[PDB]
Every structure is written in structure tokens, then in C-alpha cells.
Amino acid sequence: MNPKSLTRGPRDKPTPLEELLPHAIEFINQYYGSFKEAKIEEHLARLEAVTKEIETTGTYQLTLDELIFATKMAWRNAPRCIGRIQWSNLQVFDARNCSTAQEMFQHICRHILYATNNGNIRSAITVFPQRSDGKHDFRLWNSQLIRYAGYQTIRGDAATLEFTQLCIDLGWKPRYGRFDVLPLVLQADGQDPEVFEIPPDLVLEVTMELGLKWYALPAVANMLLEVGGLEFPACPFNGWYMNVAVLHSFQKQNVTIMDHHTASESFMKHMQNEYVLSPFYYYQIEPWKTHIWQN
Amino acid sequence: MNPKSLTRGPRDKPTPLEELLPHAIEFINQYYGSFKEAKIEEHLARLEAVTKEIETTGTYQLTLDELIFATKMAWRNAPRCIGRIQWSNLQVFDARNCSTAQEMFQHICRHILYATNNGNIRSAITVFPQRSDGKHDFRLWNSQLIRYAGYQTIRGDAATLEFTQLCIDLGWKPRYGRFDVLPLVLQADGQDPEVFEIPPDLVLEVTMELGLKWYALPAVANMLLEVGGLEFPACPFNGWYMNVAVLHSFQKQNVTIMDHHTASESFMKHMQNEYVLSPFYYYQIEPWKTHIWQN
Ligand code: HEM
Ligand code: HEM
Ligand SMILES: COC(=O)N1CCN(c2ccnc(-n3ccnc3)n2)[C@@H](CC(=O)NCc2ccc3c(c2)OCO3)C1
Ligand SMILES: COC(=O)N1CCN(c2ccnc(-n3ccnc3)n2)[C@@H](CC(=O)NCc2ccc3c(c2)OCO3)C1
Ligand SMILES: O=S([O-])[O-]
Ligand SMILES: O=S([O-])[O-]
Questions:
Q1: Which domain holds residue B166?
Q2: Which N-terminal residues, if any, form the signal peptide (chains A, B)?
Q3: Do B183 and B167 form a contact (C-beta atoms < 8 A)?
Q4: Which residues of B touch A4 (CB under 8 A)?
Q5: Do A85 and A162 fall into the same domain?
Q6: What is the best residue among B86, B267, B269, B270 to mutate for testing ligand 6's pocket, by most ligand atoms within 8 Å of CB?
Q7: B267 alpha carbon – ligand 6 mean position (Å)
Q8: What CATH number should be reported for the domain holding residue B161?
């Protein structure tokens, strides 16, 4: 075998124009090829502008349209994603102009709100600024936008035990329940991560005595979007969930799950929208294992 | 004399609870003893939970913290290791949940990347699932993560002549250069080994006409970690290298070697982290000499 790595690590310097160019060209190719025999003059022109730009600025900016196309194509290329069948149903939030962790927070707040949509889950992705030299990376240290802390008898999510310790170390006041929603650990422009509490009303939970519940919104926070040689280390996305007591409560409280109805319904919308792998979503090495602290 | 064996062979059945228990207890002892006079109540509790667990499941799971402690203590106990002076500088990757060779491959890919770190070598260990009955062993058939094949006039590394033949027998397409990087021969859950080509960009080489070069990352792939009666047959680790043309090129290309600066620097970090032997790393009998082929 010769499988490729699903992880795309850090860089301490920009991509060689000699590496970036062939990649940029192939993306513009597949992007414009999507207009089958249409816009050949548009294609050629884009090729020149992009090339000139990489040659002068050392990099290039995708159009919003190329971005939206990349996010959807990268979703289609997600091997294990079951929801990719309806890849056209995706809302893209352009935060490529984001510059601070406070701004990141606000963008993430906007995504959670739109996406949650009172239980009627909508798929969305918020794309932050692309990696430049690798020394000014935007990153969400969390693995998911919404997740429960695991403390001590483990009091919480045993799966988040490491990250929870990290938050406490960053200053986060650890309560000790088993359903504590972890704050967002946001890194902007390569700085040290800032901790921000997620407004509690933004978090929709399905109430499964046991006193059990769970969050409604499944959002991956730590992947990297690669497109045309460009890399976006911060691009949180979400879908809706795919043991029967749960299946019943999600439905009872009207929070979207991938049941037969939703399967039929979303595919229908997807279909009614009809009228190495790249782009691709890569895993990353956990940021606390690679971060060089300023403070 | 009465030296002990440095090899820890295979088992075809689980460890007797009567053998495992005294061992588990002594590890929890030294682990908790590390908090000198602190957490005696924590210690006692752990003892009960572990005992109960061995008695019910027939075995026990270390905490991530106990694992990290074991990996570092086993490094400290490595007699011939010169880098153990700075044993606190170790990154642990928990793959105890790994279940397939494809997953193993991905984990190994993640380690190589982190560890290599563009030449600025970082020490890491990736720990795979512990031996259960001995019939579902995870193993890396390679002796090192990165090594050159030796063919024929020997065309390569004479030291890897046997393993190279093995790879070819497993299906590997042998090129015939003297710097062919061998694929990874991964055994998951006791099955037959699967061959995976290491993504070439993951391999950093120091370019020593002669056309000589060498890989930057020295990683031991075939040792066994014993801790508290538990055994981990798959736990690849690495450090950085410790004839003058070489010393100069490693430095010139900024690939970490254990020179006076690195010696001062790493010890400093190690020190600034201050603010029979068990655990222990055992050698193993070469897996092709003991493997029972399914296919
Ligand atoms: C709309 C509902 C969706 C459903 C029901 C769905 C379902 C799934 C499932 C079942 C998994 C595997 C879970 C696991 O490994 O435990 C998954 C993984 C994943 N999904 Fe989705 N998903 C949805 C939306 C999205 C969106 C909007 C994107 C991106 C824009 C996306 C990208 C991916 C990625 C990148 C992974 C990992 C793929 C891999 O590693 O092979 N998903 N999804
Ligand atoms: C950080 C840099 C490190 C340096 C420079 C270093 C240096 C060495 C040297 C010089 C040897 C002997 C080589 C030989 O026999 O030819 C060695 C062996 C060994 N090292 Fe390291 N090492 C490092 C990191 C590590 C790490 C991270 C671990 C494990 C977590 C480790 C575990 C061992 C083991 C188990 C052996 C064999 C010991 C024995 O059989 O007595 N080393 N190392
Ligand atoms: C090695 O790790 C991984 O490959 N992953 C990717 C899958 N995971 C998650 C977590 C939350 N949301 C999503 N997610 C959302 C849309 N697409 C995927 N994936 C994480 C694992 C996880 O918690 N999965 C539960 C799960 C199952 C089905 C889902 C889901 C989450 O979200 C949508 O459908 C980590
Ligand atoms: C009987 O065999 C053994 O005891 N061993 C253990 C030492 N060896 C190796 C090989 C690669 N990396 C390491 N290694 C890495 C970190 N610590 C040790 N050891 C192998 C032998 C070897 O190739 N040694 C070269 C060497 C020398 C100094 C090193 C080194 C490798 O790695 C770090 O410092 C096999
Ligand atoms: O948007 S599509 O290709 O059904
Ligand atoms: O981590 S220590 O004991 O210097």
C-alpha cells in the first residue's frame, strides 16, 4: 500500500511559489471545469491573474465563489462523512478578514446561532484567514465547538480530560459537573490562545433520575482546509447527528438527526440544487503540543 | 552474576491475576510515591479500583497520566540511552484505541511529522494497545521507523538485508538504489503484517560525487514497554542523533544532533521542567520468526 497521510502539519515559512503554482493551476482547472465547456476565456484569465499574484505577493486570494466551491468539494472528498451525500447544502461564512480572537469569538458565535437554528440544524462552515508563513496561524484549540469537560470517578467526558486540564491551566474556572460546556480556546494570528466562555443560551441540549442530556450541534473545530496549495488551519464546520432513547428524544425535541425523513429531505434539497484528494479536510497536530508560548 | 534478560517474549494467554496484581500494585505505588507525601487517599483509592478491575476484566487500563509517567520512567531506566538525562522532554501519543493497520499507519505518520519538525527534532513516543492474550498483538516489524533497504555488491544497508527480502516477499516493489526508504510493516490485532509506503515528504534527509545522505530521525520501532505487569509490544519512539563531515552537515542543515549546545539546551529545558527495573523497554524476538500466518 501507499496511503497518504490524513494530517497536514505546521510550516515555519511560506510555500515555495514553485510548489504553490502547479497546485493553484490545478484548482482553477477543476473549478472552471465545473462549467463543463463554458467560460474558457474566464478560465485562462483567472490563471494569469492568480500566477501574477503568486509571483508578486508570493501567494493568492481565492474568490468567495472559489472558496464556497472548495468547502463543498472538500466535504464531498471526506471519505468517512455520511452527510456528504448532500454536499450542496452548506452555508459558508467568510471570516478571512478576521484578525483578533475577539473577532473569531464573534464569528463562532454567529455560526453556532445560524447552525443550531432552534433545533432545525443547518450545515455551515466559517473560514478564517489562510496560513501565510505558518507563524501567524489562526486555530481553534477545541476538537468540537461544543463539548463537555471531563474532571474527577471521572466527572464529565473522559474523552476531554486533557483539554479540560489545559483550560483550567489557561485560567478557566472549572465547575465540577458532568455537563460543563468547555470554553473556546482561540488562537488568532499565531498568538497564545485566549479563553472565551460560550454564551449558555447559544448551547441547545437534548434532554435524554439519570438527569442525562447532550448538546444538539456536532461541530468539528480543529481541521485544516487545503485548496489549490492554500491551507486554512481554522475552519470550523458542523452537520447534525446521525441508544434508541436518544433517537427518540432528538426527534421529540425537534433537533435534527440523520433519520430516514431527514435523509430523504436533505438529499431532495441537495438534488433540487441540481438545476491525492484536493480540496480536502486534514487533521492537525494538537496545538498545545506544538505552540511556542509568548507569555 | 545474575543479569536479567533484556528480551520479553510472546504469550499465548493473558497474565495470571496472581502475577499481574503484585505488579500493578507496585507501579501504582511508585507512581503515587512521586507525589512524595501527597495524595495518600488518592493512592489507596487507585489501588482498589485497579484491583477490582483486574478481578473483573482480568486486566487494567492505565490513566493517560500513569502512561506518560511510565514512558518517561522506562526511558530513565534505559541503561545505554545517553538522551535519558533529559527524560522529561517526551511527547506521548496515545493510540491505545488503535484497531487497524491503516490507523497504525496514520498514527505513525502523525509521529514522524511532529518528531521531525522540519529538522528541529522533538522526542516522542506513540503507544499502541497493550497485549491482552498475546494472540492479538500490535507490532511494527521494522527495527526503526525510517531505514534504507539493502540489496545487491550490496546495494543499500547491509544491516537491513533480511528485512528488505521480507518486504519484497510481502509484495514490496524493490527499487535498487542504495538509499531506498523501507515501507512500514504493520501488524494490528495479531493479524498478518500490512505494508505501507511512508509518504516521501515525511522523510527528512541530511545530505552529507559520493552523493551521500542520511535520514534525520532515529526512531526505535520494535521494543516492548512493560509497566505494572502490562506489556505494550508496539510503542515506537525517537530522539535525535548523538564522521565529522556528518556532524557538520547535520548542523549546517539545522537537523538536531546531541552536540554541546543541544546538550546544554535540552538539559536546561529538562531542568526547567523541575518546578528488576520497571517500567522498562524490552527487546523482542523478530516477529517473522514467531508469526503464525493466516494467509
Ligand atoms: C449534514 C450532516 C452531516 C452528517 C449526518 C454527517 C455525518 C458524519 C459522520 C457519520 C462522520 C463520521 C463520524 C465518526 O468518525 O465518528 C462524519 C465525519 C466527517 N464529516 Fe460529516 N456529516 C455531516 C456534515 C458535514 C459538513 C458540513 C462537513 C464539512 C463542510 C463534513 C465533513 C466531515 C469530515 C471532514 C469528517 C471526517 C471524515 C474522514 O476523516 O474521513 N461533515 N460526518
Ligand atoms: C532525545 C535524544 C536522545 C538521544 C541523543 C539518545 C541517545 C541514545 C544512544 C546514544 C543510544 C545507544 C545507541 C546504540 O546502542 O547504538 C540510545 C539507546 C536507547 N535509547 Fe535513546 N536517545 C534519545 C531519546 C530516547 C527516547 C525518547 C527514548 C524513549 C522514550 C529512548 C530510549 C532508548 C532505549 C530504550 C535504548 C536502548 C537502551 C539499552 O538497550 O540499554 N531514547 N539512545
Ligand atoms: C478520529 O476522529 C474523527 O475522525 N472525527 C471526525 C468525526 N467527529 C465529529 C465530531 C463532531 N461532529 C462531526 N461532524 C459534524 C459534521 N460532520 C462531522 N464529527 C469526531 C468523533 C465523534 O465524536 N463522532 C461522533 C459523531 C458521529 C456521527 C456524526 C457526528 C459526530 O456528527 C455528524 O454525524 C472526530
Ligand atoms: C542492539 O541494538 C540496540 O540496542 N539498539 C538501540 C539503539 N538503536 C537505535 C536506532 C535508532 N534510534 C535510536 N534511538 C533514538 C532515541 N534513542 C535511541 N536507537 C539501534 C542501533 C543503532 O542504529 N544506533 C545508532 C544510534 C546511535 C546514537 C543515537 C541513535 C542511534 O539515536 C539517538 O542516538 C538498536
Ligand atoms: O448541487 S448539485 O450538483 O445537486
Ligand atoms: O521534570 S524534572 O524532575 O526536572
A1: 97-122+137-204+283-287
A2: none
A3: yes
A4: 199
A5: no
A6: B270
A7: 10
A8: 3.90.440.10
